[PDB]
Design a protein around this nucleic acid. Structure first.
Ligand code: BR
Ligand code: BR
Ligand code: BR
Ligand code: BR
Ligand code: BR
Ligand code: MG
Lengths: 213, 223, 300, 251, 242
RNA sequence: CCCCGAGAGGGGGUUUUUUUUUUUUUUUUU
């Protein structure tokens, strides 16, 4: 099959089988390989998620010259739940826009800050699901950047409510990103309030993690 | 140990050779020292580009391991500090496995080591010393140690071994053991009995190689 | 990549020699290099040599399942990966370069597409199990003519190769080893042979586009030096049945149509001699293996 | 319309190097000349469509030269034409006591291609060199031009062989054919050849009245075994040659 | 074995054309002024081709720069909706496409005066919107027109044409149905000459028929040159008169 | 060679894909 991997025999076919509000866990700086890293685990109802973020930078960019730094974000599929490459790219773009509003790029001329988020373990226990993972990604990237020592304007956090994801800064006064799939009609005000509550809780736990730990 | 080799068979390469042991035939080529790619450049030493091509099909991860082990042998052999920021391309084209490639890569690796060494000699690249490699195997019932085993012997083996030693002083002094690749079930007593008999047959091989090298190269030189 | 530096003196000399009916190797403009074919111990092992040009081909096969679209046809692939062994001009694994893709496509259209191999006879059980024949070409030493050398290497290999005999019990495939019963040869519908022409413009471009009398020089089977100084290439493939298998003049120096036709007729005389040559070397190889089989049984 | 423009007055060129003849037929240079050979055809009484023709000479090295000559139909029927189309469609000509539905037009099958006696005819010849024990030493295939000495009948040929009054070069060759026929038939049966039988009756229609009145039986003469053995020999050698040349599409 | 009348006894083809008639040939110059220095929209039969010439301009990488000539690049985009049956995979890295791109470059390297544009790059982007036989010949005509529109110097026109061989009957300008039923020959003729820039035969052709097929193609390609030249002078007069 | 300066100074000459009307005796000459 592939000349770079061992994928086994081709006639083989994969095994198909027959028939509080949120619980968080935060850890930072456990990857010596990079500059900043974070572990974010969430458990709620019939879905738990364990994702790992890793920040590599600021490192060299050998092309032209830039007064500010350049951020790149890449999401990788984990072991269990898989997602479309397109969908992972879309979230990556959405995350790039968010942290280009938070990261003090002016302090890193001709430098690159490459942020990796590994969707290691995403279990679906219900015996576009990507929308519920987005706030946890932002939490991991924020923790990793702060752990790396990359300057941030403010602790960026987010929340999710009925397929709507919105990330806040400045005590929830302003918005650094808005995401909406499916959901209902004229439910904007309700989503903003519910997400700001999650944003506030996540921000408190993040600060608590960056300080005490 | 009735191997047969030829030197300087390729025209558009700085050095080449063709080593044959039983059914295992490998042709090797060496170009260097030459201009290296930027990603290959080493500020002080020589950069080695080592390529192994299989007898059947295209190069896979299997040959990637053959390249890696062959690198462990050739690297300390070459006086690399003589060629800073420079490149030496080393290509091995295995022409005939001489073994079940689906199970073993023993004879192909040893033949590649011997051929690469010969190609380096032909190319006139600074070497710290000489080298010889032999394949060894241990049979099931008899548990005898067979040097240079056949393909049929490998099928009924309990362990397979690749031994490559570094020789100096006219091929009499074992400077070091460049590579020992032991795979399968074996005990400590078997290991040293292997190393003792292996060193003997290796020393015999160097002597034979020294003969081949002088027989081919001397007509080129002047008296 | 790594370039071959050609001085103005060398460029002017080789071209001027052509203007005086001289080529460095001493051949003629219409002269094809002597092709030497050596068979190994195993079937499908063939070594082709044209002057300094050295290529080696190895034919192999393994049990596989046919595509859904073609349940009656077996699998057949041709590999021609270049390596720095043929020269440092070639990048290791460069399978997208202009010359590489062309060569890869010429061979494919000459052997695969042309149906030189009977892929229908590669089927063991329809839509389930079949043979997967593989032709691996190894470019050892390059002195031009890699296409012509490969086409001969592949064809000589396919005609020399023999696959293990198979008896079928429903879907249970009984693969007889060479020790039990003898192996079975492959089915060859026709024998395609490539002949490559190299074109040289002794004058300038203006006299090629608007010049009255044509003066472009064409030589058969160019060496490396002649190959690096040509202005156009033509690869024509024929067989003893007096038919054109494929023709490929992918751009290059504009050439007169009648001259290209002349090349096709000149190539036909070469492919005839080459085909008969291959057949003879195959017979003698068969006679050699049988004579040893008789001397092995008599001593047994 | 695919038939020659000459018609029934078609003729093989006297010289095989004649400028006009070579201009029309550039393949004529490959045509061998066996008009010096003593060719004869052994076929039933009312046979006008002759396919085969035989001859035999004794080479100076003691061996025999046997030549089986078959009608060169290919020279007249070309692929793509309507003549070839109808020829393939019919597949074979049917044989009845009443009539005879030909596969090819009368002008072609019962005149031009037909290896008639006393005339120059194109033919595809197969020549063997074999010993007295009918063992093939070598075999050559070649398109040629011949001239049949005489078109014998099976009864007429047998009488000419047996009478021992006629010892001309032709009859001496005919006996040589029969002698080699016995050898070839012997070896073949020893090799495991079958000898089935179904000699159907021949309706002897009353040639004095109209309706059929008599039913007799056809007798197998030694000349029938003569022709049969050499026809088989021709088919075998050709089969080996065409399969060696076209291993995948050999008829 | 074809059950359709590829060439009826009345000398008529499946589309109505006779043996020596070109398809509907409609050229179009300066179609994308804001996207390229030169552009052409080709309609040869049901074939629809957009051709863009971008340059001569600065190379994006100084590593790839020639101080003696311009760098000529050609990328052919055969869209997934070019045929009746939509192709699932892309053709961008297909070996067949790489050969086509390479072929086109090797054709115009000896026609476009690259020597008078040193240290520059000429990028040729092609989009095949619809395909119906003789796509190679249409690709050639599209590049020639677009290059001229860009004001890039060249020695002469290069006209492309395809000729099929149904048994013994030559068929000028083949469509998809005819190409599936017979072997075809693609020609690339320079100007009004007999010189071929491109000779492409991918299927079996008798050696005796090849010369006659070439003769038909060259004659047909000359007509393509005239149509290209005609439409170009027409556009020239409409622009120079303002 | 080209640009610059009242005084032979300086700057440059570019880096795998449009392929499927299915039926009951050997051999030879007809
Ligand atoms: Br695997
Ligand atoms: Br099939
Ligand atoms: Br040379
Ligand atoms: Br009639
Ligand atoms: Br007569
Ligand atoms: Mg007869």
């Amino acid at each position: 099959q592939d000349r770079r991997r061992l994928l086994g025999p081709a006639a083989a076919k994969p095994m198909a089988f027959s028939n509080s509000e949120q619980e968080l866990s935060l850890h930072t700086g456990f990857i010596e390989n990079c500059n900043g890293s974070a572990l974010v685990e969430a458990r709620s109802l019939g879905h738990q998620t364990s994702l790992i973020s890793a920040v590599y930078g600021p490192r060299s960019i050998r092309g032209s010259f830039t007064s500010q730094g350049t951020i790149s974000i890449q999401l990788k599929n984990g072991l269990l739940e898989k997602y479309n490459t397109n969908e992972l790219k879309e979230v990556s773009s959405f995350l790039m826009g968010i942290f280009n509003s938070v990261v003090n790029l002016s302090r890193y001329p001709k430098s690159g800050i490459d942020i990796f988020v590994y969707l290691t373990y995403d279990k679906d226990l219900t015996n576009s699901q990507i929308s519920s993972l987005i706030p946890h990604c932002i939490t991991s990237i924020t923790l990793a950047l702060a752990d790396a020592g990359i300057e941030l304007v403010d602790m960026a956090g987010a929340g999710e409510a009925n397929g709507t994801v919105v990330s806040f800064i400045k005590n929830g006064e302003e918005i650094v990103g808005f995401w909406k799939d499916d959901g209902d009609d004229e439910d904007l005000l309700e989503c903003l309030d519910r997400c700001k509550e999650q944003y506030n809780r996540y921000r408190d736990l993040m600060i608590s993690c960056l300080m005490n730990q | 140990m009735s191997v047969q080799a030829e030197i300087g068979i390729l025209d558009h390469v700085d050095g080449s050779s063709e080593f044959v042991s039983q059914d295992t035939k490998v042709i090797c080529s060496v170009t260097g020292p030459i201009e290296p790619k930027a990603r290959q450049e080493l500020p002080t030493q020589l950069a080695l580009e080592i390529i192994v091509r299989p007898a059947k099909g295209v190069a896979t991860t299997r040959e990637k391991v053959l390249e890696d082990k062959l690198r462990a042998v050739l690297t300390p052999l070459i006086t690399r500090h003589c060629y800073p920021r420079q490149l030496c391309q080393i290509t091995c084209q295995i022409l005939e496995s001489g073994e079940d490639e689906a199970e073993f890569s023993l004879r192909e690796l040893s033949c590649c080591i011997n051929a690469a060494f010969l190609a380096l000699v032909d190319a006139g690249i600074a070497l710290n010393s000489m080298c010889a490699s032999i394949p060894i195997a241990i049979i099931k019932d008899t548990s005898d140690i067979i040097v240079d085993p056949t393909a049929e012997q490998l099928k009924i083996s309990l362990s397979v071994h690749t031994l490559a030693l570094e020789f100096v002083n006219g091929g009499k002094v074992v400077k070091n053991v460049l590579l020992l690749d032991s795979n399968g079930d074996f005990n400590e007593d078997q290991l040293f009995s292997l190393l003792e008999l292996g060193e003997q047959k290796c020393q015999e091989l160097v002597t034979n190689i020294r003969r081949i090298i002088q027989d081919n190269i001397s007509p080129r030189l002047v008296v | 990549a790594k370039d071959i530096e050609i001085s103005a003196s060398e460029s002017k000399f080789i071209l001027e020699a052509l203007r005086q009916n001289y080529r460095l190797d001493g051949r003629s403009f219409d002269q094809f290099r002597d092709v030497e074919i050596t068979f190994g111990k195993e079937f499908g092992d063939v070594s082709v040599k044209m002057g300094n040009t050295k290529v080696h081909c190895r034919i192999s096969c393994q049990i596989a399942q046919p595509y859904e679209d073609r349940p009656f046809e077996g699998l057949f692939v041709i590999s021609t990966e270049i390596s720095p062994m043929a020269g440092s001009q070639f990048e290791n694994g460069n399978i997208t370069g202009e010359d590489e893709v062309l060569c890869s496509r010429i061979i494919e259209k000459s052997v695969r597409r042309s149906g030189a191999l009977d892929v229908e006879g590669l089927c063991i059980v329809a839509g389930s199990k079949c043979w997967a024949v593989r032709a691996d070409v190894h470019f050892l030493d390059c002195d031009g003519g890699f296409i012509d050398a490969s086409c001969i290497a592949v064809m000589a290999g396919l005609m020399h190769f023999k696959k293990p005999d198979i008896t079928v019990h429903g879907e249970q495939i009984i693969v007889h080893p060479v020790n039990e019963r003898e192996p079975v040869p492959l089915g060859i519908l026709h024998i395609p042979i490539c002949v490559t022409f190299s074109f040289f413009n002794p004058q300038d471009t203006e006299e090629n586009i608007k010049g009255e009398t044509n003066s472009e020089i064409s030589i058969i089977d160019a060496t490396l030096k002649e190959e690096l100084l040509r202005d156009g290439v033509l690869t024509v493939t024929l067989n003893k049945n007096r038919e054109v298998v494929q023709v490929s003049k992918a751009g290059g120096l504009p050439m007169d149509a009648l001259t290209l036709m002349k090349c096709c007729h000149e190539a036909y005389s070469i492919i005839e001699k080459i085909t008969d040559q291959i057949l003879q070397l195959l017979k003698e190889d068969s006679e050699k293996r049988n004579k040893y089989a008789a001397m092995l049984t008599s001593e047994n | 319309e695919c038939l020659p423009a000459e018609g029934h007055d078609w003729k093989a060129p006297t010289k095989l190097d004649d400028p006009e003849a070579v201009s029309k037929d550039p393949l004529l240079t490959k045509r061998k000349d066996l008009r010096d050979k003593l060719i004869c055809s052994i076929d039933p009484p009312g046979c006008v469509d002759i396919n085969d023709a035989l001859h035999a000479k004794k080479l100076p090295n003691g061996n025999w030269e046997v030549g089986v000559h078959i009608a060169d139909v290919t020279h007249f029927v070309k692929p793509g034409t309507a003549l070839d189309a109808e020829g393939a469609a019919r597949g074979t000509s049917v044989y009845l006591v009443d009539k005879r539905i030909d596969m090819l037009p009368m002008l072609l099958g019962t005149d031009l291609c037909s290896l008639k006696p006393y005339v120059d005819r194109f033919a595809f010849s197969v020549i063997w060199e074999l010993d007295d024990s009918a063992n093939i030493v070598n075999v050559n295939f070649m398109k040629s031009v011949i001239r049949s000495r005489e078109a014998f009948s099976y009864e007429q040929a047998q009488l000419r062989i047996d009478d021992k009054t006629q010892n001309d070069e032709l009859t001496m060759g005919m006996r040589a054919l029969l002698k080699l026929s016995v050898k070839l038939k012997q070896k073949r049966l020893e090799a495991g050849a079958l000898n089935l039988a179904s000699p159907e009756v021949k309706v002897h229609m009353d040639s004095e009245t109209s309706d059929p009145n008599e039913v007799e039986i056809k007798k197998l003469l030694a000349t029938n075994s003569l022709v049969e053995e050499f026809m088989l020999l021709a088919n075998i050698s050709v089969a080996r040659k065409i399969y060696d040349a076209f291993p995948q599409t050999a008829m | 074995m074809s059950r359709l009348e590829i060439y009826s006894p009345e000398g008529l083809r499946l589309d109505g054309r006779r043996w020596n008639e070109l398809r509907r040939f409609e050229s179009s110059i300066n179609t994308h002024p804001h996207a390229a220095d030169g552009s052409s929209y080709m309609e040869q039969g049901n074939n629809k081709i957009i051709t863009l010439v971008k340059g001569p301009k600065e190379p994006r990488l100084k590593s790839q720069m020639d101080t003696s000539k311009a760098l000529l690049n050609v990328s052919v985009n055969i869209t997934k909706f070019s045929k009746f049956e939509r192709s699932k995979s892309s053709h961008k890295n297909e070996r067949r496409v790489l050969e086509i791109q390479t072929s086109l470059v090797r054709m115009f390297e000896k026609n476009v005066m690259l020597n008078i544009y040193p240290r520059t790059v000429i990028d040729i982007e092609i989009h095949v919107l619809e395909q119906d036989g003789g796509i190679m010949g249409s690709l050639i005509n599209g590049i020639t027109l677009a290059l001229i529109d860009a004001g890039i110097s060249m020695f002469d026109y290069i006209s492309g044409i395809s000729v099929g061989l149904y048994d013994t009957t030559p068929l000028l300008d083949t469509n998809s149905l005819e190409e599936n039923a017979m072997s075809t020959v693609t020609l690339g003729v320079v100007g009004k000459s007999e010189k071929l820039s491109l000779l492409l035969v991918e299927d079996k052709i008798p050696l005796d028929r090849l010369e006659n097929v070439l003769a038909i193609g060259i004659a047909g390609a000359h007509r393509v040159r005239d149509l290209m030249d005609e439409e170009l002078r027409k556009h020239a007069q409409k622009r120079v008169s303002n």
